[PDB]
Amino acid sequence: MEELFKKHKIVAVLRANSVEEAKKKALAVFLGGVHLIEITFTVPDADTVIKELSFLKEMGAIIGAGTVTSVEQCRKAVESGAEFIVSPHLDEEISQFCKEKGVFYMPGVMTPTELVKAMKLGHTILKLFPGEVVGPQFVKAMKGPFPNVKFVPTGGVNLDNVCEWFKAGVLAVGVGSALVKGTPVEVAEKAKAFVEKIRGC
Amino acid sequence: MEELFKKHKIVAVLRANSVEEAKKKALAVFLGGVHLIEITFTVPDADTVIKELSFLKEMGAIIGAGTVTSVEQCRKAVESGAEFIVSPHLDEEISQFCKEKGVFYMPGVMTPTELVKAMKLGHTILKLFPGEVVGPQFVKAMKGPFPNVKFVPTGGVNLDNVCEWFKAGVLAVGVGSALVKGTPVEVAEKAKAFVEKIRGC
Amino acid sequence: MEELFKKHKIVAVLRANSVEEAKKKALAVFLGGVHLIEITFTVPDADTVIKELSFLKEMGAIIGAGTVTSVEQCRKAVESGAEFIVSPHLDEEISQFCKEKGVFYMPGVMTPTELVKAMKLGHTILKLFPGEVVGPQFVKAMKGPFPNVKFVPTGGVNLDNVCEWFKAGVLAVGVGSALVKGTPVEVAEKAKAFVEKIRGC
Amino acid sequence: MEELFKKHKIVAVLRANSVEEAKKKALAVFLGGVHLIEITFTVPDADTVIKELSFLKEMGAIIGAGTVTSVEQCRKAVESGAEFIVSPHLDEEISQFCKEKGVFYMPGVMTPTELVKAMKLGHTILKLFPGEVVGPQFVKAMKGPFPNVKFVPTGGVNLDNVCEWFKAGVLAVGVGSALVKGTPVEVAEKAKAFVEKIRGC
């Protein structure tokens, strides 16, 4: 899995108001070149969307679940075929469950104390969230004491600063509203703009 | 079926060099607002593409087959779930087969003699091909002797003249290379431009 | 209680160097239109001030306790008639005690991990502190994964930015030194300026 | 120990790529007037460097260990004669060990919740890290609810802002790359510039 992040260098963090909106947006994103799509559990019947998008997996997409905040949600996400589980926070109970099921799990951290607590569970890739608050500087600071930890920031990434996150040394960037807000066509165009900007830095 | 043509007012006539290209282009077209997609039998394993795109049917797409030139091809297209069969020409053998299977069939004509030969088989919607040769004038001429026949031209339709075909009085327009040539993103953008231009005329 | 926050939209976080200073400042704040006053346990004999200000409760004030950092302090605050308990941090022991006594309790969080740990205790209103560090952006980021959590930032609120906190979507703002620093008259005037600015946004 | 921090008002947080580099840099720093040197466990055989620099202790240096992230590392640091242990985070297990051995221990915090959790262990001096993220504002905010806690920020300190950290009211500043990056001569010169700038504010 880690290798997939390194290759693609972008995750779409997809939020929608309905099942229908979610599926159409997932397609708009895929076509642009963003092969990693995270279906958030803030989408009604998110579980359904994860299963019904299984036809994209065959085309080279890797579909995961986001905003997973309990072991009960996590189990539904894995059973429904999620390729990876992402949480907003660090959770010991979910981390244990995923390990037994062998599903890659990316917890969230914001502080050195949360960071170390994650590392003791064996995690070396961490979600940095909210990114816009801690900023690119956080990643540069962490490189010092923890050379072997890599971050995927979520929140605040846009076409003016996406290259600064990469110059600091992140693994990949997650993009929310800056990507997926708009019509299905506008979204596809924005997605292209991100991939070109990343491959260019 | 006729009602679907009247509502959507556009068909994509999809040609590709591979199975993979075809599926990605079908998606680029769908998202833009073009709900009628014709998978031509000039695409290698076109039959496969028709079946594997069945997940779009659930989203409101109607997927058919194009350039069907024998009863043997037609049967494979129908068995694979094609929603309609389109030929480049008028063929008595295919017309008979489709009627028994109850699948809408749109033959091709170019001349008044081919036109009348079709009408005697009970067809009232005809494919006009190649459109760029006969031009918009053909449709205006046919309105006279055959008020009850409607055309769907294919070939030569573009963003400079698509409204002239509608002002003459066609049922819908089929678009080939002018739509589907380009990258998956460029295609989606072109598709939007067509739908907006038609709804505007 | 929640309803009271929604109506008033401001809390004074009162710090003083003596019992006498605290009571006079509480009055300066009340008269201006700020009906929610938090008496911090950094005021000597804070407990006394909470009891002796009980005559304001009859006039429509709701007087609570702030900077409550142990179960021992909390019990004294509740026994002395505090209408709500506010802590600088999330504390399981205090949260349990207040629940049994039925006194509204607003814990502090700074990180998504602290946030979720609070939600599991049943808290939906959280103190965001220090606000000036995390900024207005934190609230916008949290709206995504936790649509059902609302914040009351403390620290950094002033007459130049108080409307940005509201546009992000906070429940209410707590104001410290920017309000309560100055003479009893100057404080009353500042309080008026805040209420007018909030009602205006 | 606290008294030593108050007197010197600067710590060098030393990172190096080899044993040899570390020893030469420790000397460059010492001569400039920075008597507190923290040998990070990111230096290969950091333990060796701590022991072999014991000749500086006689000259008035106080040599400690940094980036100590397990009880196993901590024990080696103390046995090797470290004068103080610094961690990147708050750790209950290390805090207990050091207390029994009587070695001053400075944990890391970033949030009010981490802060209070430290205070319950009896710590009144805290490492604030990463400083550049939380900024000088964090210290001003904490002065309110916790008048009796003092910070030593690490990260982001430089010759343009070192006086702002002191005006907020920190105990001392830790300096990383802004000091120790460069040749042994350049480092000595930078060290002088820091001491003069601090004594001047």
Author numbering:
A (entry chain A), B (entry chain Z), C (entry chain Y), D (entry chain X): 1 to 201
From the paper:
Here, we present the structure of a protein complex called I3-01, determined by CryoEM. This designed protein is derived from a trimeric 2-keto-3-deoxy-6-phosphogluconate (KDPG) aldolase (Fullerton et al., 2006), modified to introduce complementary hydrophobic interfaces resulting in self-assembly into a hollow cage with dodecameric geometry and icosahedral symmetry (Hsia et al., 2016). I3-01, comprising 60 aldolase subunits arranged with icosahedral symmetry, has resisted high-resolution characterization. The I3-01 complex is large (26 nm diameter) and hollow, resulting in an assembly with a high solvent content, potentially making structural elucidation by X-ray crystallography challenging.
Using a newly-obtained dataset, which allowed multiple rounds of 3D classifications, we determined a final map at an overall resolution of 3.5 Å calculated from nearly 150,000 particles. Using our 3.5 Å map, we performed fully flexible refinement of the model to obtain the final structure. The experimental refined model, while close to the original design, shows some key backbone and sidechain movements that result in a tighter and more compact designed interface. The rigid-body subunit movement consists principally of a small clockwise rotation (≈2°) about an axis approximately perpendicular to the 3-fold symmetry axis, while the largest differences after superposition are found in the three helices by the designed interface on the 2-fold axis. Another difference is a movement of the sidechain of residue K23 on H2, which repositions such that it forms a hydrogen bond with the sidechain of E52 on H3. This interaction is also present in all six subunits of the parent aldolase crystal structure (Fullerton et al., 2006), but was not accounted for in the design model. Model refinement in Rosetta allows convenient use of Rosetta's InterfaceAnalyzer application, which calculates several metrics important in the creation and optimization of the original design, including binding energies, changes in solvent accessible surface area (ΔSASA), and shape complementarity. Applying the InterfaceAnalyzer to the novel interface across the 2-fold symmetry axis shows that the movement of the interface helices increases the number of interface residues from 52 to 56, with a corresponding change in the calculated ΔΔG from roughly −30 to −37 Rosetta Energy Units (REU). The InterfaceAnalyzer provides a breakdown of the contribution to the overall ΔSASA from hydrophobic residues; this shows that while the total SASA is decreased compared with the design model, the calculated ΔSASA for hydrophobic residues is increased, suggesting that the refined model has improved burial of hydrophobic residues and provides a rationale for the observed differences between the design and refined models.
